[PDB]
Symmetry: C3
Subunit: 54 residues, 3 copies
Amino acid sequence: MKKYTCTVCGYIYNPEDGDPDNGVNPGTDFKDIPDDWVCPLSGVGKDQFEEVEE
Amino acid sequence: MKKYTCTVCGYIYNPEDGDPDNGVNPGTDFKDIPDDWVCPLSGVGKDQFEEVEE
Amino acid sequence: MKKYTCTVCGYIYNPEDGDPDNGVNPGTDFKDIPDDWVCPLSGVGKDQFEEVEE
Ligand SMILES: [Fe+3]
Ligand SMILES: [Fe+3]
Ligand SMILES: [Fe+3]
């Protein structure tokens, strides 16, 4: 699965880790995170994230 | 997937659109919406909805 | 699916029933419950639960 980065604050969503404190378990692809989730650091929505392409 | 309507207020849940502001992504069948979700307009529970049959 | 028990208060999570008032539908395996869910009786996290083995 791909990593996504918040373009406002640089936080990286890593699908291996998830975001368990906000209900997003390990192994969750970014597209499957509920659409009301926000960046843990900056508080902005999913629409300010983009794929980390290698 | 089928559309469901709130029988209290007439809101239509359309699975193609979801209800993304409340965490229900596009493509979510009504049976899979978490059971604590409520109608966005009237605030009533899933048990007041019924299938829109054609 | 296996039942899990809260080791703090003895609550039993039964996957057939779920915990629908807190958004966990019937048929949800414990591993798939969002990781910010807490025991309905004692308020403690998933890390204080263990499998009920028969
Ligand atoms: Fe951010
Ligand atoms: Fe309604
Ligand atoms: Fe408990």
